[PDB]
Symmetry: C2
Subunit: 156 residues, 2 copies
């Protein structure tokens, strides 16, 4: 799955949301994918239980999280969402987050070779966090996704 | 596990090697970790079988591969190796590789949140592939690893 098409098909870009804490922020990012049927409802409980037991395992760079769990915890199909908050929330390891890109992968192989390269392309644009946060409409975010496509991560 | 310390403890930096094909290139990168006991011998057969059945799932950017398999396929402990070839080899998807950084992770959580950020920091240095390939001694590669430490991927 390609980011743009996942976003469109899942209607999973939801911007300018307010979360009081990390568990809420996480709920907001996965809910769009429960509604589309990309993931089962349990996927949510899994991310939270994994987070509580292990700490955040998905805060790739400061400002962003890619919340996910194992495929076996209720992924039906490959999908992504993107949620931006109006204020950062603090995760359990002291890390602040304002942008959440939830990930549903049907295998570790596609997580590593297909999903992560596309996520890192997006976030390596200049001022990617600040620009994502100033996006008002899904079309704006997708214009950013287009611009990420000349990343070396995307060549194969 | 930190890259430098994995490299030192596992003596798993082996430079200027010649491989005729992709299966050999892969053998060379994992062998150092079998010798140290980071992985069981079967880890090798797994990478090859997974590759044959799925295609390369670890060629993050052109020129490099991070060959790996699931923890259950014989990882004893977290470790890395680094192998550079004298000529590129072609993988099954048409992709050329000259640098191999084999990865042993005890869980998908550490693969994603600990191993990949460190690997991407190394490879985002300027001319990282060309500089890795001109390294003669493990100490040279480790000087590069030091220089990667100011990456934003490494801040948490």
């Amino acid at each position: 799955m390609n980011l743009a098409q996942a976003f469109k098909e899942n209607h999973s870009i939801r911007l300018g949301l307010t979360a009081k804490d990390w568990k809420e922020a996480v709920k907001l990012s996965v809910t769009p994918l429960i509604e589309s049927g990309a993931v089962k409802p349990e996927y949510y409980n899994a991310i939270i239980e994994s987070t509580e037991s292990y700490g955040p395992y998905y805060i790739l760079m400061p400002g962003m999280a890619m919340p996910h769990a194992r495929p076996e915890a209720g992924v039906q199909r490959d999908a992504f969402s993107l949620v931006t908050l109006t204020e950062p929330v603090t995760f359990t390891d002291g890390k602040e987050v304002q942008v959440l890109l939830a990930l549903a992968a049907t295998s570790s192989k596609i997580h590593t070779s297909v999903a992560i390269p596309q996520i890192i392309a997006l976030f390596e644009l200049d001022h990617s966090i600040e620009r994502l946060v100033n996006c008002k409409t899904p079309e704006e975010v997708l214009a950013m996704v287009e611009e990420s496509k000349s990343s070396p991560y995307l060549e194969g």
